[PDB]
Design a protein around this ligand. Structure first.
Ligand SMILES: CC(C)(C)c1nc(N2CCN(c3ncccn3)CC2)c2cc(C(N)=O)c(N)nc2n1
Ligand SMILES: NC(=O)c1ccc[n+]([C@@H]2O[C@H](COP(=O)(O)O)[C@@H](O)[C@H]2O)c1
Length: 312
């Protein structure tokens, strides 16, 4: 296989393998059987081994990691990563809804999402290419964990469209991976992780990307910070649009027209809670219309258009 034949074949394989990987990791719905992916994967690895100069950032062989950093660099957030006000009872929720109605002057629809137990991260894309990944940190400055995020399978290295955007989401570790990880630590005489959140956070502080690639972390994107060319005028639309451009979003989302539908939603998943492959510790209620979120604005620490109902 010449260099010219390999240069061309590599792009075809990356193109196809990344599509398969998208259906598998992002949609949780693989089209082909693993052995189909494996052969093609092995074929690209042969080509990459023959011509290491054909290796690209979006090549699926990169998910295994390799870089070891001396430490993390500061990662300023152009747009703040605010906190969330909390509600602990049915009353707190209706109390919040009344304040929202008092400020807006009419009933408002809420986009409801599960409060994923993990670590909030920000992703930056230039012309569809993944260029930066950062932890939330203190809200205005986090850590630059770009190299580690490259190993998180559901994080696209190249979007379905060459657009430039900044999105924020939750990076977590599924219950079963959490369980196996602790057994592994127990076997090695290490201290186990108290919960999945700590397992995720601790994994993302790891400097050896080879290790982080094995931590089996996943993601759920919940917001667009810098829209770029994106349309979306409501949170519900933002979530569908995050999915359209190639991000992993949470299927359990729901748009509720009333505060009563929101409570029914809370109760619904309050039961289903234990049946999810990941831990949640509540529900995040968001004023759907961006025009309305803008009206409500933010307090000094959190938006006045959202509240997180924390489970008891
Ligand atoms: C965009 C806004 C600001 C409304 C927002 N902020 C969130 N969080 C704030 C507190 N952040 C935080 N992280 C660590 C320590 C303290 N606060 C972690 C992100 C959200 C968290 C989740 C989730 N957990 O599934 C979610 N579906 N939507 C969110 N939406
Ligand atoms: N059927 C598919 O489309 C698909 C896509 C990506 C990974 N996989 C599987 O995931 C596992 C890990 O593979 P990678 O290390 O290449 O990510 C393998 O067992 C592989 O077969 C299957």
């Amino acid at each position: 296989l010449t260099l010219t034949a390999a240069t061309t074949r590599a792009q075809e394989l990356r193109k196809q393998l990344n599509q398969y990987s998208h259906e598998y990791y992002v949609k949780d719905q693989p089209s082909v059987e693993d052995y189909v992916y494996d052969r093609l994967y092995k074929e690209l690895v042969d080509i990459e081994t023959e011509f290491p100069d054909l290796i690209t950032p979006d090549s699926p062989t990169q998910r295994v990691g390799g870089k070891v950093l001396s430490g993390f660099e500061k990662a300023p957030h152009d747009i703040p990563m605010y906190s969330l006000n909390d509600g602990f009872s049915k009353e707190d929720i209706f109390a919040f809804d009344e304040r929202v109605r008092k400020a807006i002057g009419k009933p408002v629809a809420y986009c409801c999402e599960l409060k994923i137990d993990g670590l909030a991260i920000s992703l930056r894309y230039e012309n569809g290419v993944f260029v930066r990944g950062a932890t939330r940190g203190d809200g205005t400055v986090g850590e630059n964990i770009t190299e580690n995020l490259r190993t998180v399978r559901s994080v696209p290295m190249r979007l379905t469209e060459p657009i430039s955007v900044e999105v924020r989401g939750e990076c977590y570790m599924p219950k079963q991976s959490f369980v196996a990880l602790n057994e592994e630590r127990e076997e090695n005489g290490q201290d186990i992780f108290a919960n999945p959140r700590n397992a995720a956070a601790g994994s993302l502080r790891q400097l050896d990307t080879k290790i982080v690639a094995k931590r089996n972390l996943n993601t759920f994107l919940y917001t667009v910070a810098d829209f770029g060319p994106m349309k979306a005028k409501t949170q519900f639309e933002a979530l569908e649009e995050l999915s359209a451009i190639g991000f992993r979003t949470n299927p359990e989302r729901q748009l509720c027209q009333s505060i009563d539908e929101v409570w029914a939603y809370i109760e619904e998943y309050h039961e289903k809670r234990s049946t999810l492959p990941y831990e949640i510790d509540g529900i995040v209620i968001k004023v759907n219309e961006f025009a309305l979120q803008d009206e409500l604005g933010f307090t000094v620490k959190a938006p006045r258009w959202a509240i997180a109902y924390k489970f008891p």
